[PDB]
Amino acid sequence: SHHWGYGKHNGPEHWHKDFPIAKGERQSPVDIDTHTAKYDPSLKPLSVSYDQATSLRILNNGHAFNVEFDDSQDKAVLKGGPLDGTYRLIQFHFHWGSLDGQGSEHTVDKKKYAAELHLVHWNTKYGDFGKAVQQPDGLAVLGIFLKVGSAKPGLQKVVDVLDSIKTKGKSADFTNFDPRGLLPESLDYWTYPGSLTTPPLLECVTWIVLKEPISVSSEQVLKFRKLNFNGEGEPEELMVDNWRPAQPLKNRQIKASFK
């Protein structure tokens, strides 16, 4: 049967047939043109409070892998930056390429990074994630670019569990993972209003994209590329190039927290 994905017959250019909002006015990702983004001195520093984070499980969902968190309390939250109120971390995942020259969803002056990390948070004033994705300020996604260079020590625990979730539908216990080990040194950022980048493509996201990439080693991103989109017992299709390309910016402003 048919299902959305990243192949020739079901990739991003097809998604609008199943999810018409794919051609909407607030779609993500976008290219970040650094000479059009404006420094906004009213933006606050981003406040990342992850000290009490409780990771639970890691899941291969047939499109990427999600590291899931306990979001029943304000244990891992994002405040400040462009945001009003408190946004709770629910999961993170990545998008990556088949080659080091592509894989990111956002681009910076058309530059593609090897991968992009998305830490997904929902606005606590809406009570749960499902209600938050019915609201224009329901979600905040912290996006972090990955370039290939030196290894990221805080990523290695993720890399080493991937063999146990090779195929679609597999999950593994994944407790005591500290997402602070995935941050770069600087929290300077760009921000703009956008959407989820996979179906259902809902236009609920305040994007916060960090200026500084993290470095990961070639071996680390190689292990991402050994995952499978297919389920166990089906023919192997490598999980690579699970990124949506840049979408039209339309009426939107990208702001910078730094100059």
Ligand SMILES: O=C(O)c1ccccc1O
């Ligand atoms: O980030 C996405 O594209 C996404 C899609 C569906 C559900 C949760 C999500 O974070």
Ligand SMILES: [Zn+2]
């Ligand atoms: Zn994503």
